[PDB]
Design a protein around this ligand. Structure first.
Ligand SMILES: CC(=O)N[C@H]1[C@H](O[C@@H]2[C@@H](O[C@@H]3O[C@H](CO)[C@@H](O[C@@H]4O[C@H](CO)[C@H](O)[C@H](O)[C@H]4O)[C@H](O)[C@H]3NC(C)=O)[C@@H](O)[C@@H](CO)O[C@H]2O)O[C@H](CO)[C@@H](O[C@@H]2O[C@H](CO)[C@H](O)[C@H](O)[C@H]2O)[C@@H]1O
Ligand SMILES: CC(=O)N[C@H]1[C@H](O[C@@H]2[C@@H](O[C@@H]3O[C@H](CO)[C@@H](O[C@@H]4O[C@H](CO)[C@H](O)[C@H](O)[C@H]4O)[C@H](O)[C@H]3NC(C)=O)[C@@H](O)[C@@H](CO)O[C@H]2O)O[C@H](CO)[C@@H](O[C@@H]2O[C@H](CO)[C@H](O)[C@H](O)[C@H]2O)[C@@H]1O
Ligand SMILES: CC(=O)N[C@H]1[C@H](O[C@@H]2[C@@H](O[C@@H]3O[C@H](CO)[C@@H](O[C@@H]4O[C@H](CO)[C@H](O)[C@H](O)[C@H]4O)[C@H](O)[C@H]3NC(C)=O)[C@@H](O)[C@@H](CO)O[C@H]2O)O[C@H](CO)[C@@H](O[C@@H]2O[C@H](CO)[C@H](O)[C@H](O)[C@H]2O)[C@@H]1O
Ligand SMILES: CC(=O)N[C@H]1[C@H](O[C@@H]2[C@@H](O[C@@H]3O[C@H](CO)[C@@H](O[C@@H]4O[C@H](CO)[C@H](O)[C@H](O)[C@H]4O)[C@H](O)[C@H]3NC(C)=O)[C@@H](O)[C@@H](CO)O[C@H]2O)O[C@H](CO)[C@@H](O[C@@H]2O[C@H](CO)[C@H](O)[C@H](O)[C@H]2O)[C@@H]1O
Ligand SMILES: *[C@@H]1O[C@H](CO)[C@@H](O[C@@H]2O[C@H](CO)[C@@H](O)[C@H](O)[C@H]2NC(C)=O)[C@H](O)[C@H]1NC(C)=O
Ligand SMILES: *[C@@H]1O[C@H](CO)[C@@H](O[C@@H]2O[C@H](CO)[C@@H](O)[C@H](O)[C@H]2NC(C)=O)[C@H](O)[C@H]1NC(C)=O
Ligand SMILES: *[C@@H]1O[C@H](CO)[C@@H](O[C@@H]2O[C@H](CO)[C@@H](O)[C@H](O)[C@H]2NC(C)=O)[C@H](O)[C@H]1NC(C)=O
Ligand SMILES: *[C@@H]1O[C@H](CO)[C@@H](O[C@@H]2O[C@H](CO)[C@@H](O)[C@H](O)[C@H]2NC(C)=O)[C@H](O)[C@H]1NC(C)=O
Ligand SMILES: [Ca+2]
Ligand SMILES: [Ca+2]
Ligand SMILES: [Ca+2]
Ligand SMILES: [Ca+2]
Ligand SMILES: [Mn+2]
Ligand SMILES: [Mn+2]
Ligand SMILES: [Mn+2]
Ligand SMILES: [Mn+2]
Lengths: 241, 241, 241, 241
């Protein structure tokens, strides 16, 4: 089997194994700051991508990879009543570039069909296509999630996320936990990677502040990822990676 | 650090690394059948325990272990309207023996304070101390869960469970997923192992059928476990173990 | 190609080409009354099925049928503030029988995985798994719709519905129109019949009144259906059938 | 009853049953290209008309026809931010000729009252009389739609449209679906053909590129039509025609 994995308890400035786009920068304090601040600046868009391409599925053997990703993130909203727009974990073509900001989370464009992009969003603003209240959603080539669930978020608190994909069942699972609040949310749905993503892809984060309002800033504090493409043990990744 | 882990996609009869109690037996088909059947027989109680003792916390260093466990289980109810009693994953003293059946899931006794037993239950019957509807609960030395959440169960379908404990935050998280139903449930709460469990313990399963009604049978199909006691990477355990 | 179709501007009592289940009866006025009245009686469940089995897909050739169905229905709610539960158009195994009432619309059962049943619902009551406000949803083997959209309903007014399935794109489309209100709603999503339904099935309607409240009654006034299983022209069905 | 209908999965060059006006031509690939390209050329106007006149309503009997039309179309915009002007399906007097281009979609003229022309537009540019954002509208003798609704369009994707008219209710319904996006839009309103169209008319398409900008090109890929003038079954037309 073909496998890859990595784990960081923090980020380091100028680290050559990461690609930054938009307003994203890593602070000296080891934080991946996706949006500009001075309080969030409106219309800010930043994305970060793990430099090395991941082999998601193979056209020959036809086998698809299973993977797991976890990270700690937080947002700061100067006004918890006017939140916007959100954060997303995504997989996309190797040459992926930033797209439309605000409600499109920098992954899609209005009037166009999305590229081969798959993502798990943490949406804070209700756009026309959205359900009411902040939510977690699974996006498959569209900003219009195929499924969502309410997200009990907390301003300034660290959220711990775990995203897992089981190739055997094609099931994608996303769970979010707030240790300090002992609160938790989970979502799951089947996704077919063979028809929604190219064989090789890059993974990363994308976040956007309000279009005309500060909304909230987004910071990723740590990141862990493991993938196994067959010719798995998640308990070892949640306790290991 | 001190570490231990194991992973099985199935069970084998007479396997010397497991301790069976009650009516529990492993079929030739590789299934850990916890309750007697002929349809579930009432008042049946079976438990299985991983033979090797786990070092959960150390009195000297004072450090506590982090761990992860996953398994696939299912129940069969000849009548989905009269379910009883449930299944539980637990940690207990090395010399742990079966206790009261039915509503006590074989872990506790009426009129007595529970031993140093910590468990995650999948409760199908509403006893006096229970909330309404099947649920997932975190039990700490008591059959009366410190916290619970509704469990959208499905008869005869395989449920995939992931239980994780983070020593740094003392947070215990339990999630259950039904691939075929794309349905999911999650629960979390802080638990202090130092004051609710001895340094060394054994882990296993316990299930009970109705006291005077068949209720449902319980079968565990696979099992995976990893523990790390410091002087972790879960992504590697969900994809590895 | 294998084809079948039928069209009725009204129902006739004792018509031998229809199967009635539950409280469903056809009035002398030519109406298919699915629920008992005296104002709707609580806990009423009725279903009607076209007697002849439809060949939906073929295991050999692997081809799947395209079909179209239209009908006029209405509900009467003595109190438009307490509506429950809804109406559904469905396809199911030939020997399909009524299931759980109320929120389950007589198609599914609590604690069990749905049979091979596909349906388009017109939901008036918000159950735990439902989104807010009356809606139209596409159910695939589950009472939990894979997709929904708000339904601007009107008490006592006749709604004209058109459901179409295109085998070439696997897309299921449902549209509802209120001539008198010049109001309209539409929904669409892909559904794979090969994996959610048996080769042969029966089609019909199912409606349920509130569990403990009258809710509203449901009457189907006309019905039209056409199917084409390849080794289509919908314009001819909306103007013909 | 008097009836007529036709159905094409593609167009053939020089086909004698169609009338082309403006820049409209049919490619060798079977596409009805309404606008000149080289990317769309600004100020381009093309129209196509089914050669045979349709009997819409009869002055004697006073009866009005019911009809259904469907087609697949697409537009290509080199810049999805500067779209213009749109496409329309229309009914007009037998001797109908092209009118003003750009925002008038070649159907109307500035400073003049429209002839007896009825149309369903797919408007991409906001003119003074328009609502904001691309939309679908019902035009009755005027470029100023009597009703509209937002149109979630996608560049380069094939849209499947279904327009139906019910003489019994005088209701005109237009629905548009994007299979690849599982997205859908619908609109409806009453229209009185007797007072807005002559007894006999010709039907066709009309599209216009931006006045001073390329905007987008418009191609119709297939076309189906059925009409019934009484002294209907649409399910047969969506699955048949
Ligand atoms: C952003 C923008 O261009 N606004 C112009 C505004 O546009 C009207 C529409 O309103 C805007 O719609 C946006 C949806 O795309 C919405 O963005 C959302 O923002 C939230 C954060 O609040 C969040 O990020 C979300 O994800 C975003 O989608 C905007 O909030 C919203 N703007 C407002 C003020 O509500 C919409 O109403 C539409 C419906 O018909 O009409 C559009 O016109 O239009 C105004 C004027 O009408 C325009 O303001 C003018 O700008 C000029 C310069 O461009 C001059 O400065 C002029 O003085 C000023 O009035 C906005 O620029
Ligand atoms: C189990 C038992 O001993 N029942 C005797 C019964 O006891 C009365 C109490 O009823 C029982 O309460 C149990 C709670 O501990 C309950 O168990 C639950 O069972 C469900 C499955 O259904 C599930 O597993 C759950 O987790 C369990 O807790 C029993 O279901 C319930 N039994 C019934 C029939 O409801 C309770 O009502 C209490 C309140 O005051 O009174 C107790 O007396 O009492 C009956 C007689 O009253 C006794 O039956 C007699 O048994 C004799 C032999 O022992 C003779 O056979 C006699 O003919 C017969 O009537 C039950 O044995
Ligand atoms: C229906 C029923 O059995 N109700 C008993 C009630 O149950 C509690 C639960 O409440 C009920 O939950 C139903 C969900 O399955 C809900 O049904 C929905 O009804 C609406 C129409 O309103 C719609 O159709 C929808 O689709 C349905 O799902 C009921 O409306 C709801 N009932 C009420 C009154 O709100 C729920 O609250 C649950 C949470 O813990 O607890 C259940 O216990 O429980 C009461 C007593 O608690 C019971 O009433 C008793 O019945 C006895 C006979 O069985 C005696 O008559 C006794 O005097 C009486 O109090 C209901 O029968
Ligand atoms: C098209 C035209 O004749 N433009 C002359 C321009 O006219 C002024 C008006 O502006 C134009 O208004 C059009 C509305 O009918 C608008 O058309 C829309 O185009 C979009 C695509 O972008 C879409 O198709 C939509 O459906 C159409 O309706 C034009 O876009 C718009 N043109 C511009 C540049 O914005 C309008 O502003 C009006 C308000 O008072 O004033 C009119 O004058 O006027 C300019 C000069 O003012 C003229 O340009 C001159 O042309 C001369 C030759 O005729 C010479 O070349 C000279 O050098 C040049 O400046 C435009 O021809
Ligand atoms: C989520 O990850 C972040 C990043 O490692 C953790 O925050 C760091 O925790 C250490 C504790 O050893 C502190 O010294 C650092 O200052 C923290 N970094 C930042 C940027 O705050 C955090 O503990 C993790 N949270 C959870 C719940 O696991
Ligand atoms: C949960 O674990 C069980 C046990 O391994 C899995 O069931 C086995 O799946 C294999 C597929 O390779 C079958 O050949 C065996 O017959 C199954 N065993 C039994 C006892 O049924 C199951 O696939 C796992 N489920 C999920 C969702 O991962
Ligand atoms: C929907 O179908 C019903 C059933 O045919 C139509 O209602 C009948 O309309 C005729 C008109 O010729 C009346 O004479 C009957 O009394 C009606 N039947 C009933 C039970 O009311 C109705 O017109 C159709 N509605 C639409 C919008 O097409
Ligand atoms: C809409 O109609 C067009 C025209 O027939 C369809 O496109 C053709 O589809 C066939 C598939 O058998 C291809 O071989 C042709 O190359 C296509 N023609 C063109 C010009 O592209 C299209 O499939 C239809 N779309 C939907 C959703 O029904
Ligand atoms: Ca949003
Ligand atoms: Ca219990
Ligand atoms: Ca409901
Ligand atoms: Ca316009
Ligand atoms: Mn969203
Ligand atoms: Mn319990
Ligand atoms: Mn519903
Ligand atoms: Mn317009």
């Amino acid at each position: 089997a073909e496998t890859v994995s990595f784990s960081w308890n923090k980020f380091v400035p100028k680290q050559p194994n990461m690609i930054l786009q938009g307003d994203a920068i890593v602070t000296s304090s080891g934080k991946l700051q996706l949006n500009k601040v001075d309080t969030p600046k409106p219309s800010s868009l930043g994305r970060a991508l793990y430099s090395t391409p991941i082999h998601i599925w193979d056209k020959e053997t036809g086998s698809v990879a299973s993977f797991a990703a976890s990270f700690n993130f937080t947002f700061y909203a100067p006004d918890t009543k006017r939140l916007a727009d959100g954060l997303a974990f995504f997989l996309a073509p190797i040459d992926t570039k930033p797209q439309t900001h605000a409600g499109y989370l920098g992954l899609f464009n209005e009037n166009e069909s999305g590229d081969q992009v798959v993502a798990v969003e943490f949406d804070t603003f209700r756009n026309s296509w959205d359900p009411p209240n902040p939510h977690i959603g699974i996006n498959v080539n569209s900003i219009r999630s195929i499924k969502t669930t309410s997200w009990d978020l907390a301003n300034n608190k660290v959220a711990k996320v775990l995203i897992t994909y089981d190739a055997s069942t094609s099931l994608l699972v996303a769970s979010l936990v707030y240790p300090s609040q002992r609160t938790s949310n989970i979502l799951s749905d089947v996704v077919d990677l063979k028809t929604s993503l190219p064989e090789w892809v890059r993974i990363g984060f994308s976040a956007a502040t309000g279009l005309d309002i500060p909304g909230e800033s987004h910071d990723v504090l740590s990141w862990s990822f493991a993938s196994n493409l067959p010719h798995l043990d998640l308990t070892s990744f949640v306790l290991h990676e």
